[PDB]
Design an enzyme around this catalytic site. Sequence first.
Site, PDB file in Angstrom:
ATOM      1  N   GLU A   1       1.344  -0.896  -5.178  1.00 40.63           N
ATOM      2  CA  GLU A   1       0.535   0.486  -5.630  1.00 40.63           C
ATOM      3  C   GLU A   1       1.313   1.466  -5.645  1.00 40.63           C
ATOM      4  OE1 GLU A   1      -3.911   0.016  -5.289  1.00 40.63           O
ATOM      5  OE2 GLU A   1      -3.752   2.373  -4.443  1.00 40.63           O
TER       6      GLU A   1
ATOM      7  N   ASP B   1       0.833  -1.303   0.036  1.00 40.06           N
ATOM      8  CA  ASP B   1       0.087  -0.015   0.062  1.00 40.06           C
ATOM      9  C   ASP B   1       0.809   1.243  -0.008  1.00 40.06           C
ATOM     10  OD1 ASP B   1      -2.750   1.338   0.312  1.00 40.06           O
ATOM     11  OD2 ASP B   1      -1.854   2.044   2.297  1.00 40.06           O
TER      12      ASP B   1
END
Length: 483
Positions: free
Chosen positions: A261, A231
Amino acid sequence: VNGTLMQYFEWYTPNDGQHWKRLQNDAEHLSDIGITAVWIPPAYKGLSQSDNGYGPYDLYDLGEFQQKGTVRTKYGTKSELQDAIGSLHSRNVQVYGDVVLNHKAGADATEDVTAVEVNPANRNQETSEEYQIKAWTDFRFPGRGNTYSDFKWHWYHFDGADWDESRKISRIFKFRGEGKAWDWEVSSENGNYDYLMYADVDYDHPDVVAETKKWGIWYANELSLDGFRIDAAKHIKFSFLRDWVQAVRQATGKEMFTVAEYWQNNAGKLENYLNKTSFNQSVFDVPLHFNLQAASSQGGGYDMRKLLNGTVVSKHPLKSVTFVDNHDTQPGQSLESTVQTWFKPLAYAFILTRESGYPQVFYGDMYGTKGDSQREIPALKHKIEPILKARKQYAYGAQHDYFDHHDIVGWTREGDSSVANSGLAALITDGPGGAKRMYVGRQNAGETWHDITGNRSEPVVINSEGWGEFHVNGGSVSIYVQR
Ligand SMILES: [Ca+2]
Ligand SMILES: [Ca+2]
Ligand SMILES: [Ca+2]
Ligand SMILES: [Ca+2]
Ligand code: NA
């Protein structure tokens, strides 16, 4: 077989504590439709029971300690999660865990800290003199005590925060301390984008680095994970993410597939991340998401020949994870940029039947989103499943592309002799329908092929040369395969 990832959650999944049981009960179905790996939401205790997991409080509490007034997380208890993972594994489906390392939220208490304010548009610039604040940085884990790890957090394990409890003001505060500075390298947006929200972890501190590696190994072993989703990667020191992945791989002996990400609509900056992490992990193809969304919103006016322009998949196909929508882009969210519903089946055809990229199906598209707007995504599982069967059983062998018209574009797959009856011919259009002559291989000469989507009822016969004339309806998709 072709691999296919599934993101198993949406922003509005209910806080009923039954999400792990739902996953457990869906394992047979996912394995039958061709899913080979599932990405699960953050499984550790957040700042409250109802947090989705992106404001993590204790990474070592997987729903088994009494903290924040709850034992379970939003998703369920630790033993329910371990049973769901056992069910997927006995059906040969891999499990990737979400990794939220940029910040910590929900501290037990405040501490006094000296700090300076910095400019939000240029965090390299200090805009105040130093003064004292009360920041939420004391993490003591009262319900866990020392189980698994005796590490306790304080202000000096963090680079900054966004709230002063003293004066009750929100600013971007950089802490003063020994060798304190924002971490590098991180995105250079806003000068230095190390700071995002809550209490920002300092990856320059050697005990922090050592403890976070130890936690990674623990997490992978405790849940028998097969990989990870990282993340907020553009906000964390790149060389630390490279080394953290490598240390878990070294210690478990497993491949540990990892996708980060890195949220930016710019191929060049995504390539810089790949180079800086030594090509040891993939990235999500953010630029392709934006191209698909654009085509879906111009009512036929987009030039479909340009779908691949500026995407990571056209440059680094083996390091890209392709996707249509996710929990960030769904209606009402922060980065809302949803692909319109009429184009969604065309977009799934594009990512699931082409040879490059590792594709992800979104839970919110299969089952619908349960947000409170009037433009929720409807359940499209009956439109997506025929396309998944085309990926599982027919998308094999050499590919031929036909990006030669501003509305109607297509591609073919010749099939592979080791996958019986494999081979396909796909057509999509953002405007009126029509036809295209395409080559599917001379080895498929004389066969009857039909549209597996059911959008067209007339079959097509492949001529002696290996060419067929395929048709497609207006604003639709057709995928022909052996009848
Ligand atoms: Ca730092
Ligand atoms: Ca950071
Ligand atoms: Ca067009
Ligand atoms: Ca054939
Ligand atoms: Na930092």
